[PDB]
Amino acid sequence: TRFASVYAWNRKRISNCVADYSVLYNSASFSTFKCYGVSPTKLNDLCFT
């Protein structure tokens, strides 16, 4: 519902979960999606620390 202001930006810890980002395919639409140090087609085979 509410995002933060850029000057006081929010950091949230993510843990104990499965990243099946294809659940976003139905609802979300992103103008920008750029990944650094990893390839986009590799995100399904990795575990993130």
Partner 1 sequence: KIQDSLSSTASALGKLQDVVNQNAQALNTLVKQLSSNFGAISSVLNDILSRLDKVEAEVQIDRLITGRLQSLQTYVTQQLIRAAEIRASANLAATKMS
Partner 2 sequence: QCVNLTTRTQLPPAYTNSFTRGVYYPDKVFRSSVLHSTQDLFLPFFSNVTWFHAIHVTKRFDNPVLPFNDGVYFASTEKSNIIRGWIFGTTLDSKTQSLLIVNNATNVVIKVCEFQFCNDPFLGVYYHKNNKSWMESEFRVYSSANNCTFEYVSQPFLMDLEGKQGNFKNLREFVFKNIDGYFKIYSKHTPINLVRDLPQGFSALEPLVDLPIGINITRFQTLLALHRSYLTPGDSSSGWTAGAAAYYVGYLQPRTFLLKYNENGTITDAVDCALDP
Ligand X SMILES: CCCCCCCC/C=C/CCCCCCCC(=O)OCCOC[C@H](OCCO)[C@H]1O[C@@H](OCCO)C[C@H]1OCCO
Nearer to partner 2, 2 or 13 (CB): 13
Report the nearest approach of partner 1 to the CB of residue 39 (Å).
Answer: 4
- Contacting range for a second copy; rule: CB under 8 A; set: 2-10, 12-20, 40-48: 40-48
Q: Are 21 and 43 in contact (CB under 8 A)?
A: yes
Q: Which residue has the tokens 């659940």?
A: 23
DSSP at 19: -
Question: Please, which residue, 9 or 30, has the CB nearer to a second copy?
Answer: 30
Task: Establish if 11 lies at the interface with ligand X (CB under 6 A).
Answer: yes
**With contact defined as beta carbons under 8 Å apart, do 33 and 40 qualify?**
yes
